[PDB]
Design a protein around this nucleic acid. Structure first.
Ligand SMILES: [K+]
Ligand SMILES: [K+]
Ligand SMILES: [K+]
Ligand SMILES: [K+]
Ligand SMILES: [K+]
Ligand SMILES: [K+]
Ligand SMILES: [K+]
Ligand SMILES: [Mg+2]
Ligand SMILES: [Mg+2]
Ligand SMILES: [Mg+2]
Ligand SMILES: [Mg+2]
Ligand SMILES: [Mg+2]
Ligand SMILES: [Mg+2]
Ligand SMILES: [Mg+2]
Ligand SMILES: [Mg+2]
Ligand SMILES: [Mg+2]
Ligand SMILES: [Mg+2]
Ligand SMILES: [Mg+2]
Ligand SMILES: [Mg+2]
Ligand SMILES: [Mg+2]
Ligand SMILES: [Mg+2]
Ligand SMILES: [Mg+2]
Ligand SMILES: [Mg+2]
Ligand SMILES: [Mg+2]
Ligand SMILES: [Mg+2]
Ligand SMILES: [Mg+2]
Ligand SMILES: [Mg+2]
Ligand SMILES: [Mg+2]
Ligand SMILES: [Mg+2]
Ligand SMILES: [Mg+2]
Ligand SMILES: [Mg+2]
Ligand SMILES: [Mg+2]
Ligand SMILES: [Mg+2]
Ligand SMILES: [Mg+2]
Ligand SMILES: [Mg+2]
Ligand SMILES: [Mg+2]
Ligand SMILES: [Mg+2]
Ligand SMILES: [Mg+2]
Ligand SMILES: [Mg+2]
Ligand SMILES: [Mg+2]
Ligand SMILES: [Mg+2]
Ligand SMILES: [Mg+2]
Ligand SMILES: [Mg+2]
Ligand SMILES: [Mg+2]
Ligand SMILES: [Mg+2]
Ligand SMILES: [Mg+2]
Ligand SMILES: [Mg+2]
Ligand SMILES: [Mg+2]
Ligand SMILES: [Mg+2]
Ligand SMILES: [Mg+2]
Ligand SMILES: [Mg+2]
Ligand SMILES: [Mg+2]
Ligand SMILES: [Mg+2]
Ligand SMILES: [Mg+2]
Ligand SMILES: [Mg+2]
Ligand SMILES: [Mg+2]
Ligand SMILES: [Mg+2]
Ligand SMILES: [Mg+2]
Ligand SMILES: [Mg+2]
Ligand SMILES: [Mg+2]
Ligand SMILES: [Mg+2]
Ligand SMILES: [Mg+2]
Ligand SMILES: [Mg+2]
Ligand SMILES: [Mg+2]
Ligand SMILES: [Mg+2]
Ligand SMILES: [Mg+2]
Ligand SMILES: [Mg+2]
Ligand SMILES: [Mg+2]
Ligand SMILES: [Mg+2]
Ligand SMILES: [Mg+2]
Ligand SMILES: [Mg+2]
Ligand SMILES: [Mg+2]
Ligand SMILES: [Mg+2]
Ligand SMILES: [Mg+2]
Ligand SMILES: [Mg+2]
Ligand SMILES: [Mg+2]
Ligand SMILES: [Mg+2]
Ligand SMILES: [Mg+2]
Ligand SMILES: [Mg+2]
Ligand SMILES: [Mg+2]
Ligand SMILES: [Mg+2]
Length: 63
RNA sequence: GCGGGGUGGAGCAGUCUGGUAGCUCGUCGGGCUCAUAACCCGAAGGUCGUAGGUUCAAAUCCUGCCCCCGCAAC
RNA sequence: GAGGUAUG
RNA sequence: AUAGCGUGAGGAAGGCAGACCCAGGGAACUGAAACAUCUAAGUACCUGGAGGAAGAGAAAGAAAAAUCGAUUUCCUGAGUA
RNA sequence: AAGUAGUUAGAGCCCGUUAAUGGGUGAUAGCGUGCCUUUUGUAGAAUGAACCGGCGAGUUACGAUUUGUUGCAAGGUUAAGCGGAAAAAGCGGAGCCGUAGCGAAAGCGAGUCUGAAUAGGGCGCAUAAGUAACAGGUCGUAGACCCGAAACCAGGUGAUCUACCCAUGUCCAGGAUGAAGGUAAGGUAAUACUUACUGGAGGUCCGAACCCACGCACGUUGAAAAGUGCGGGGAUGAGGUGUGGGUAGCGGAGAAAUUCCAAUCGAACUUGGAGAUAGCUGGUUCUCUCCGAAAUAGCUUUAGGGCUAGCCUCGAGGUAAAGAGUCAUGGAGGUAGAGCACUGUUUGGACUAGGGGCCCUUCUCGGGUUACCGAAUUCAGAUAAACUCCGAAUGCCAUGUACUUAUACUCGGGAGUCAGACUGCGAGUGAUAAGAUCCGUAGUCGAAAGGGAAACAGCCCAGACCACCAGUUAAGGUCCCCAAAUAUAUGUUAAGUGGAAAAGGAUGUGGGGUUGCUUAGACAACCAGGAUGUUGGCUUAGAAGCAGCCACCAUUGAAAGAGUGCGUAAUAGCUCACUGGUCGAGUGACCCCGCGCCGAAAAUGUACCGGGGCUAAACAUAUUACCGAAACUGUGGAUGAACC
RNA sequence: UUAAGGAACUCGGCAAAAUGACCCCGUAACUUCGGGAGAAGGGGUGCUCUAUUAGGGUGCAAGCCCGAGAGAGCCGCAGUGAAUAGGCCCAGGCGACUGUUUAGCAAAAACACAGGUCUCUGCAAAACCGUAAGGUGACGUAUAGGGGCUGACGCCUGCCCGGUGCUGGAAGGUUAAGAGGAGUGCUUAGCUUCGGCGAAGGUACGAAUUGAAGCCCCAGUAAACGGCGGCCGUAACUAUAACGGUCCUAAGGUAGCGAAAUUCCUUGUCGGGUAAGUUCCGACCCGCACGAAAGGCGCAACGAUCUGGGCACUGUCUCAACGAGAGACUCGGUGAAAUUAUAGUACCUGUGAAGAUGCAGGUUACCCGCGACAGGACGGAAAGACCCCGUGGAGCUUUACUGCAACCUGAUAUGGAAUGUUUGUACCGCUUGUACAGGAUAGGUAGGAGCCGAAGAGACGUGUGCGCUAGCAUACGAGGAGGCAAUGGUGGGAUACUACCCUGGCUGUAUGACCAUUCUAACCCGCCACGCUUAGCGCGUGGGGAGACAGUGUCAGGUGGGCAGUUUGACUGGGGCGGUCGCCUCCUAAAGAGUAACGGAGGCGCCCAAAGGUUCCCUCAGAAUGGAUGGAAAUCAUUCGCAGAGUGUAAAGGCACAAGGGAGCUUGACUGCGAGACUGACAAGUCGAGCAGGGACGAAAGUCGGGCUUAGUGAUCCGGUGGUUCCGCAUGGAAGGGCCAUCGCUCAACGGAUAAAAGCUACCCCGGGGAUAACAGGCUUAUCUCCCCCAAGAGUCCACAUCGACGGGGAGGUUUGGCACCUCGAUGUCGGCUCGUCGCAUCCUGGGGCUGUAGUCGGUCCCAAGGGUUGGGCUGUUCGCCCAUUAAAGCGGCACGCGAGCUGGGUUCAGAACGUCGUGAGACAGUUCGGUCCCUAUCCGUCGCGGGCGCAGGAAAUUUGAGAGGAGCUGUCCUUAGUACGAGAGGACCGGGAUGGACACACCGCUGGUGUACCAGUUGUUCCGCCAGGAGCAUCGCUGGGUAGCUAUGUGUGGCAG
């Protein structure tokens, strides 16, 4: 869920607000790209933590 | 576009592990009652969204489509 | 005789 | 009685040559084209002891059908095992 | 009068030399965007340098390998050490290399290992030159080419700044407010309680000194490495300050900000390990001569690094001369194209299993069936990177004795390269865009000067050893800038097209090809008629030549359509078609070719031929001269390889 | 200092102005009853006389100081006359407060605070520093001390203990070192024949059993970490749901508050305030995503806090003017710096590493300077801090990896004496022995035919014990000899009795473990008395206390970000996400081979004991009919049929004289190898006739070293297994190794870094790069804007007045984008201010054509760039909405013009906080508060001023005018004429004239401003010796005026007519 949350954030990082101007928005494209990168890094860190949880197996319900 | 799901009327399982249709509420009928409810007695109602596949056989395994709830996009 | 100890 | 205290006879204390050696303690940078075993390295550095040298040293040894005869240093063995 | 500052031509002026086709200056004319670095590419609006001078970067030891030289040669050589002048011999043969290899080894031995093998094959021998020393090249270990990190570790120095604290001192003008408490009067049964007075509390108020630092301005190569001025907060308290002291970096102090620990703090300063390491950038100093790349493959914790190969150079080899080019001949191959013989996509037609409906019915069983669809089947015709019955050119493999020509291969030493750029051709991605990107192919640049494209890496022509006040030529050009034709002949163009841009529009202009009418009279104008039954016949407020629907004939006449449009309630009127008179020669319709026009507009200043300016100095066709390069030649010099 | 206005400025009332002192009157909501409060709002202040004053202080008195009201007057614009000395009010958020904080960008809503709460701690406290001693704590003692959280006060603080931590438990499971030492190998004295067997001892390795804490487990615990849900339906209907059902939960958010320091949509809606309000106040509640000690809600006082409004005040502004002084300027003296390749350093257009002082072509331009401005020199400074890269670094975090301290725990040594429980082991005794069938309570082996017994048998009676609840044994009373077996049957087995056993159970002994209690002599005492000794250290002596515990050492397990060292991929039309990474097949791939891309399509990580080998045999798909279930299509007959089938599996190639299908026999799915080729960097992969060995099939020829072919896989290193005429560190062995065969890799990031590895950085750093991004430029032009072709149609009709579908073509280079070509040894960003300039695709004015143009007004289109093209509210804002005007309120280019010209609100520097995501460090084109914009102008250029020379003599004046700049705008009213036109409503063209706005120029006579060497008034104090008159300083002291000069807001004129 947090991973979806950071995906939403990352997609928003690079779409400028209505309040902005073209020329003004164009100046922070790169820093917003790096914010986006940081979000993606958070995502990959979450995936690593999920791996570190393990492949816990559902218990066996004998038929 | 990404997730959940689609199984009698409602909500939920059952799927992963192919042969098994289930729990609660409800519905219909007959009793009790002056009558309704509650209670007691029985019964019905699902081909598991859909079209095709695999299999001896599919709710169940594979594929495409169509719908609903969320989240995004817009 | 007094005092007390489900619905219409 | 010992502790302690006092007296006397000796002795030490400290320094250096930013060198050489003996011990105690002991890194990391680096290299491995990361890195942790490993390396760098028992190096640098601290400290203690010294002496003109120190250390080692007179086989509980090295070796092999043949024996050699205390230690040390050099050449080789060898960049071999 | 601009001009990488000179150069080449060159007057005039002035001097007189290492005397030699001399010196200094230079009006003027032509040409001309520094050096270095890194780059596909730099005048570069990329980097570096103020200038001048000095210093400042491949070295030494030891080892490996190879080349050359010398000595001995199946042998060669000594190391330490004795000796001795910090010598030279002599001694020293221990050891090292080579002479025999093969095998994991035992072991066998010109053979050996594998293997059952006597087979074959691997490695060797056959097929015999090494060794010691010197020098050159390179490699390795060492800082190893020079400079350069941020950081790490170890030993110490620092709390005279600053944080916190310890003890001891000291400072806070003046004013204001008026807590608790207390006393007295009133009040009460007694308390409450009220009023006054007293009192002097407070992280209290106001406000200087003191401390701080909120705002603004100025300063900002400052008066000052944090201040100045004007205002501002606290100012008896969690106060300010002095003196002396403590806490020390794997740490301490923190009313806590990553704050402070001597102008240094996400871990001080100094010294040492230490020339850390740096696949990174920068730099790396004299000359000429010969040859001369690459920006690719593959692998890579790899992508701006490296390694091997491909490409360069040097040397030596070997010959059944193997290279390159063309000719001939023989072959693989399935592209372009073409085709439909399969597979897909598809158009039209024939025809239909089947589905939907109207239904007749009816246990909706089966029919009437519907063009409402319709699997398929079949006929003709289209289409294809991942379709092919077919199938080239080229390119490739080879053969040859053909005919030219100059390499190719092998071994060894030494590298550098692994960012590539445009252009043309073929394909992708892309948008059939990009100076985009990615392959293939060839070329140029890179690493290439020169002539032409105005200027211009990458286009066109073409390859600079040197000199020459010689010649012929290429591309491109010949009126002037600007060298050479105001060239020759025939035509086109009228826009400055040339010297920009589309669909599309257009009686532009020229040339062809057709076709109709026509001196028994065309076209064009002018004039006259243009009728009638019926107003065709319905509708409507209208339709009555000319809203719509259908019907679309007849009469006379030279002609007239049951009328081509404007218009009306429809009339009406304007008019058309058609007819005749007048006139007197070409006239109207199409298709193609060429050259032009409109479409067509942008931002400092004409500004889309380099400019002037050209109507030929443009375009097409053909031709003849000339200019024009560092090309080629001529003349003379220097030089490399091969052969003489 | 300023006319008039007065916040229109602006991010914002920044700054400035205004207030200001003493006395008096008077003073609100609210309030924690202290305050608010100097609230606010207003008045008076001078001098003289009454006045040695009423009255006070002092004093023996004389005298000397303080000076209360009042009247009566005097003068000024003004009487704290100067200087010094609060601006106030309303509303709101936050934090209660005073205080502290990032020395040198942040003063705050952050820290602290008192207060609350949890928690721990019995004193040699806990916690901390340190190796330890020793100390703080504390010279204290649970009303004390440490840590965590919250943050005055008021009302309150809800549910959840499933997880995670913390506490406690104590039965079991798992769990070490150590203890134990069953056994196994090797060795060999002998035994054996070779092979081999093998005692003792030594040696290598070692199983059982034992073995703590922790963990698993159970309770509890939330002011501990933390968490606080969905779906369907339901009211007489319109909506919604008080109500019901059901899943999941550990439990599903209580109060209170709420577009919030939190609300995206969102400038939400409504209301208020304003002409106009993205801000503000109050309410609403779809709370994207409040919420109860990460505290909730509220709140007086406080605040250099943030926010909104108002009164006053003002040069903030409309829109600037004057004055003073300091620089600047000239003279004299003295005398740097950053920088610098050399320089004789123009403009346009273009080209060019795509933005030229220096190139080209044109145009301008005499030489040398001075003062001023800053467009450019991609100017200077600072080897970009953004971005990317580097197998670079530091700091931080954690359930990344590996470790370390520290603690907990156990064994063992220091370190011994008893007693006792509970198990264990061995021995003596005594009881124990039931499947079934069978007389019935059969343990086994053997003997066994007789055996026991009056010195006490069977049987009877009683109790006790067992137990299969049948009965067995055991003792006790009487009694006194009799019983049972053999035999038979039952059965695996026989009964009597005898012995040796086994299985348990009990007593007794003897050994040997664990645990507990006690003792005391080791050790310890941060207890006392004494002594050394003037000593709160130490040591000794005597008591007292703990005591085999503690502590220390060695070993071992656990916990362990408290501390440490490190890791945390590459390609990539920037990086990142997504995807991919190795092998096979096609297309691309351009007819040999090869050939790239984040180019288009698919597959693989197997299977088959027949799906192989051979020998023999035959041949498919599909259609046409004929036919019973049976049909579109099962199976059958005939015909057609080069393959339209199948080929284990993707595709390509190939195959019907099989490589496709059956059957038989079999295992060549063999061992050794292999001339030679393919491919190829290497590693490797591929094909291979044939030789030998020994076989299978077939009569034989001959074929067969897997499958029609092409994928089906992974190095070494290290281990394991089997085998071997190999080695075996003195010899014999052995261990250990080699050699051959084989095994163990989603080492799939597949030529594999290590056995073993994730993250934050907004506190950051270094080396590099325009090889690589963000701004700007350049190329392109899908898009964007603009223009047009066609013309169905709309428009009573009528395509083309005005629009114009389906489709089509272009221009431009303002948008979104693509490319990555200059610049990373610095090319500064949005918005605004100053200044503008250019284009035209013209907004207004001007001219005109068409009109579905009556007139007025208008629509559309052509020519035109001369001039003009507003001021405010909200927001940082461009944009946009609104108010009000205008003739009109143009679109765009210039590094979306302009930061060596200014601002610096926003943003993305460090602080802090909200909500949210994260265990966390931390982060968010989510928000909020707060926050350092350096430079002395060399050259060109620009604006002005001079010097030099020339202009064929040297001078003085006046001048033509090439050429060049400037200006160029426009409304309203009257009239024409209420004429034309119109049914009316309405209402012109053209023309004539008057008066204005904005703008420019000039000037100061007027209105005003300024006027620091003019005049006056006046305060305090010093001086001129005193009075008087004057002077100095106090912003020129303040104040009232004001000359010249300068000047606008004032006046004159202008753009007329052409
Ligand atoms: K000695
Ligand atoms: K051989
Ligand atoms: K210092
Ligand atoms: K709300
Ligand atoms: K400038
Ligand atoms: K840059
Ligand atoms: K500028
Ligand atoms: Mg089923
Ligand atoms: Mg009732
Ligand atoms: Mg390393
Ligand atoms: Mg320049
Ligand atoms: Mg420089
Ligand atoms: Mg120099
Ligand atoms: Mg010190
Ligand atoms: Mg105070
Ligand atoms: Mg105060
Ligand atoms: Mg001050
Ligand atoms: Mg104060
Ligand atoms: Mg002081
Ligand atoms: Mg001090
Ligand atoms: Mg911080
Ligand atoms: Mg070192
Ligand atoms: Mg260095
Ligand atoms: Mg050459
Ligand atoms: Mg083709
Ligand atoms: Mg093809
Ligand atoms: Mg390119
Ligand atoms: Mg090419
Ligand atoms: Mg190069
Ligand atoms: Mg050239
Ligand atoms: Mg040229
Ligand atoms: Mg060049
Ligand atoms: Mg040449
Ligand atoms: Mg010639
Ligand atoms: Mg000429
Ligand atoms: Mg030549
Ligand atoms: Mg004023
Ligand atoms: Mg005034
Ligand atoms: Mg305003
Ligand atoms: Mg404004
Ligand atoms: Mg202010
Ligand atoms: Mg505060
Ligand atoms: Mg500060
Ligand atoms: Mg500050
Ligand atoms: Mg507290
Ligand atoms: Mg202690
Ligand atoms: Mg707090
Ligand atoms: Mg526990
Ligand atoms: Mg604001
Ligand atoms: Mg709570
Ligand atoms: Mg304060
Ligand atoms: Mg000056
Ligand atoms: Mg740099
Ligand atoms: Mg760490
Ligand atoms: Mg390291
Ligand atoms: Mg990368
Ligand atoms: Mg090919
Ligand atoms: Mg041995
Ligand atoms: Mg790889
Ligand atoms: Mg922050
Ligand atoms: Mg850097
Ligand atoms: Mg670039
Ligand atoms: Mg760009
Ligand atoms: Mg640029
Ligand atoms: Mg520079
Ligand atoms: Mg610069
Ligand atoms: Mg126009
Ligand atoms: Mg605002
Ligand atoms: Mg505004
Ligand atoms: Mg700009
Ligand atoms: Mg700006
Ligand atoms: Mg500049
Ligand atoms: Mg700001
Ligand atoms: Mg932010
Ligand atoms: Mg801000
Ligand atoms: Mg200046
Ligand atoms: Mg100057
Ligand atoms: Mg005047
Ligand atoms: Mg005076
Ligand atoms: Mg006087
Ligand atoms: Mg004075």
């Amino acid at each position: 869920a947090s991973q979806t949350h950071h995906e939403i954030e990352a997609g928003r990082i690079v779409k400028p607000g209505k309040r902005l101007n073209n020329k003004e928005a164009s100046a922070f494209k790169a820093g917003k790209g790096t914010q986006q990168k940081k979000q993606h890094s958070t995502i990959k860190a979450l995936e690593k933590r999920i791996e570190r949880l393990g492949n816990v197996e559902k218990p066996h319900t004998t038929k």
